[PDB]
From a paper:
To identify the binding site, we co-crystallized linear peptide 3 with the recombinant calprotectin B-RCAL lacking the His6-tag and with the heterodimer linker cleaved by 3C protease. One copy of calprotectin (S100A8 and S100A9) and one copy of peptide constitute the asymmetric unit, while the calprotectin tetramer is formed by symmetry. The binding region running over both heterodimers explains why peptide 3 binds to the tetrameric form but not to the dimer. The electron density map of the peptide shows that the middle and C-terminal regions of the peptide are well defined in the X-ray structure. We subsequently tested the linear peptide 3 (all four cysteines replaced with serines) and found that it also binds with comparable affinity (Kd = 26 ± 3 nM).
Common inflammatory disorders such as ulcerative colitis and Crohn’s disease are non-invasively diagnosed or monitored by the biomarker calprotectin. The peptide uniquely binds the calprotectin tetramer, which enabled robust and sensitive quantification of a defined species of calprotectin by ELISA and lateral flow assays in patient samples, and thus offers an ideal affinity reagent for next-generation inflammatory disease diagnostic assays.
Residue numbers in the entry:
A (entry chain B), E (entry chain B): 7 to 113
B (entry chain C), F (entry chain C): 2 to 19
C (entry chain A), D (entry chain A): 2 to 90
Write the structure that this text describes.
């Protein structure tokens, strides 16, 4: 198991922790998504987590087939966005030269 | 844990039915 | 505060990409040869079996001869979706 | 202030995508049928000739049955690169 | 010519306005890129344009083959990012419900 | 203008040579 595979494993295991609780066991409903986000994105989504309605629009946006649950396929878009927004913050206001990372999201 | 055979059904209706 | 394991996972994906992007050249560029090293070291067989050049053609959406970070996220998304389906076999 | 023509161009690309994403369903989702309407109306023949379903498979990187905005930007990038090469024929 | 094709035309025409001035006529060197950005991204990149070194790191980042010019293939990545960052600002702090756009970048 | 036959050469070395 590589570093990337392990990270992938952690995304899948975290999704499964909340998807199994209610309704479809392989999808996240509004309440399960709120719980995942409150706990396991508590730093990356600190500011959004203070506004339950912001969390609701995020879920509405990720729910690409409009069936009011997040499949894993829909959810991994949020992981990619947060990864991308973390890397962006590492480079926010970068003046160069060369490559350096400031602290990422939730820091 | 290495997720193998999670044993409940995978969601598969990745399309619009509204 | 201390990051959750999920958040550390996402930052680590950043870290993984940079092991290969910082080998040479542009700091956010993974050239074709670096991408073979990335696939062979970081991805499972059912990903690698595609061939590093077929992956490179898929990921280099602007055909500038490099995989930048957003293009690498295409690879990460496809590996996650594949890993999830396999967990239901 | 007033936007430059280049900036208006970028905002208009947003506007284009939403003509199709706002037809039904999720507001940032272009389903397979909407994508055929988008290709046939907005893209030239050398883009369309690929077939709307081959494009849909290429653009839906997470295979959730929709093209979201970032996936549509893959299409925009490929059309721009193609349009540029054609301008050197 | 469609709306999208016209927009594509404007990106290509704007690139060509500055790429032909010096050196390779089909690429943007540091000085040509600074000029394009100062004039034609004067609103989207208002804040970055106040710091010539920020503009230099951006070019260094887009110059994926490290040959100190931007090809058109490298440049259209910046157009996609700015388009994406404009749409993000239209949805910044969105609470829903449904779809609505606030003003975009440079506004 | 609809860019056709811009007539100067297109840059084509989309790879690393450093
Ligand atoms: C699944 O098998 C699993 C579940 C939890 C952990 C964990 O959080 O520690 C791991 C895992 C390890 C398991 C055994 C071991 O000896 C060492 C482990 O190291 C790590 C390190 C990271 O970063 C994540 C997970 C493990 C495995
Ligand atoms: C190229 O042929 C070209 C160059 C400049 C313009 C322009 O900025 O107006 C256009 C163009 C038009 C040309 C002729 C005409 O009768 C109407 C035009 O409308 C537009 C509208 C937009 O939004 C951009 C460009 C043109 C064409
Ligand atoms: Ca559930
Ligand atoms: Ca859904
Ligand atoms: Ca590329
Ligand atoms: Ca999709
Ligand atoms: Ca030049
Ligand atoms: Ca270059
Ligand atoms: K699952
Ligand atoms: K050109
Ligand atoms: N529907
Ligand atoms: N080099
Ligand atoms: Na590199
Ligand atoms: Na839609
Ligand atoms: Ni970086
Ligand atoms: Ni929108």
């Amino acid at each position: 198991m590589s570093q990337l595979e392990r990270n992938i494993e952690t995304i899948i295991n975290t999704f499964h922790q909340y998807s199994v609780k209610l309704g479809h066991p392989d999808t996240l409903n509004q309440g399960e998504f709120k719980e995942l986000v409150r706990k396991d994105l508590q730093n990356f989504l600190k500011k959004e987590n203070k506004n339950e309605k912001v969390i609701e629009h995020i879920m509405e946006d990720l729910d690409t087939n409009a069936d009011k649950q997040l499949s894993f396929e829909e959810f991994i878009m949020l992981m990619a966005r947060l990864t991308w927004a973390s890397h962006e913050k590492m480079h926010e206001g970068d003046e160069g030269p060369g490559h350096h990372h400031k602290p990422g999201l939730g820091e | 844990r290495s997720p193998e055979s999670v044993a409940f059904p995978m969601f598969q209706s990745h399309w619009y039915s509204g | 505060p201390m990051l959750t394991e999920l958040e550390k996972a996402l930052n680590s994906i950043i870290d993984v990409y940079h092991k290969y992007s910082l080998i040479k050249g542009n700091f956010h560029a993974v050239y074709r040869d670096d991408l073979k090293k990335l696939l062979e070291t970081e991805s499972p067989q059912y990903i690698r079996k595609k061939g590093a050049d077929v992956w490179f053609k898929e990921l280099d959406i602007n055909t500038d001869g490099a995989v930048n970070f957003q293009e690498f996220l295409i690879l990460v998304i496809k590996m996650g979706v594949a890993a999830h389906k396999k967990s239901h076999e």
